Design a protein around this ligand. Structure first.
Ligand code: HEM
Ligand code: HEM
Ligand SMILES: O=N[O-]
Ligand SMILES: O=N[O-]
Lengths: 182, 182
């Protein structure tokens, strides 16, 4: 449908905030709930603390054989069992964005094995990647993960592996918003 | 800095329309002038026939050696002598966008030599690429070229070569707006 998603932190919404972890750089204000809208929001209610937005876009790095591997195991969003979610806004450094395409692909997969590592956690973890640097937002990406509680430990292990990678040496802001489906 | 540009076809603007060539698919209404703004415009003005918008973004295909060659030879915009320009909005097919990154890169450069051929013409041609598929626009890209009249025949030769390329088999809408500086 609409390629735009808005995440409004405040007092209403479909998701309850469990905790907010300020991984790197300035964090996000603590709020009660997150309201997720499949569209752009002009202004947020007075009782909202922040608004995040991003759009779904085309593939930027993954190659055909990687997409085939993902498609064989990828789970759908909105599984009945997937009552936990994590929203992770990420900003990468200017030095990352000034690099050419071969340099960034080399770091993303040849050195960091982003997709190969991520594949190990499917189909337990469902995901949605949104882009927002081109919208002028404070973050460059909004990443969304959801899973049943049984996979919480596996997801924490994934996070540890990702943040140890060469790719994460270019991450300059990151926040984790942990959520429970209402 | 603002990464957004709007092109408004209508009665006023910095560029006078010389001709519009509706190359492929639905065309653009003939107008007297094109007004170019470095920002977003909420609505299409009353006296305007169309409003196109796009954003400047990061590199998607060019590799380091290609980028070095491009950045070293491309002219600046708004040269005294560059009184001719061409605005070429382009839309690619759904089949293009569903391909993986290696598939699209291979078509763009390996099979079509987009950058290698373009570099032959770039010394006299200033260029700006803007993206707009992610904005929900009716085109996917807005391409902008400007040059002195002495290079008109060379630019037409470049267009002849690119429209014969494998990449152009995926172009499904294309309009040429030829302009003269006011
Ligand atoms: C759960 C398993 C995961 C899988 C299968 C996975 C897969 C992928 C793939 C294939 C891409 C590239 C999309 C493209 O080519 O445009 C990507 C991009 C990205 N992923 Fe993941 N990912 C996973 C987990 C994560 C996690 C846990 C994070 C953050 C903590 C994350 C952050 C990102 C970011 C920021 C990008 C954008 C990279 C860029 O364009 O520079 N991913 N992911
Ligand atoms: C004048 C010499 C030219 C040069 C040096 C050149 C170079 C380039 C480069 C390097 C890119 C890739 C940017 C990136 O990696 O993200 C690109 C993209 C593009 N160019 Fe050109 N170009 C030229 C002429 C043209 C012309 C005449 C047209 C249209 C008739 C055109 C249409 C496009 C389009 C539509 C894209 C976007 C491709 C995509 O992302 O799928 N270019 N050009
Ligand atoms: O792979 N980030 O949703
Ligand atoms: O290369 N199109 O600006």
């Amino acid at each position: 449908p609409n390629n735009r998603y808005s995440f409004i932190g405040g007092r209403t919404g479909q998701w309850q905030v469990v905790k907010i972890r300020n991984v790197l750089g300035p964090g996000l204000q603590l709020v009660e709930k997150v309201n997720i809208l499949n569209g752009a929001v002009a202004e947020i209610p007075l009782d909202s603390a922040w608004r995040l937005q991003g759009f779904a876009s085309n593939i930027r790095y993954a190659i055909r054989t990687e997409l085939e591997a993902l498609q064989a195991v990828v789970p759908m969003l909105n599984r009945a069992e997937a009552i936990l979610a994590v929203l992770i806004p990420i900003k990468k450094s200017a030095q990352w964005w000034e690099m050419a395409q071969d340099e960034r692909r080399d770091i993303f997969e040849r050195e960091s094995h982003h997709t190969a590592v991520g594949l190990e956690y499917l189909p337990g973890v469902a995901r949605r990647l949104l882009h927002c640097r081109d919208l002028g937002e404070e973050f460059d990406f909004l990443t969304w993960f959801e899973f049943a509680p049984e996979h919480s430990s596996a997801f924490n292990e994934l996070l540890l592996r990702m943040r140890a990678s060469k790719e994460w040496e270019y991450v300059e802001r990151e926040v984790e918003v942990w959520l429970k489906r209402l």
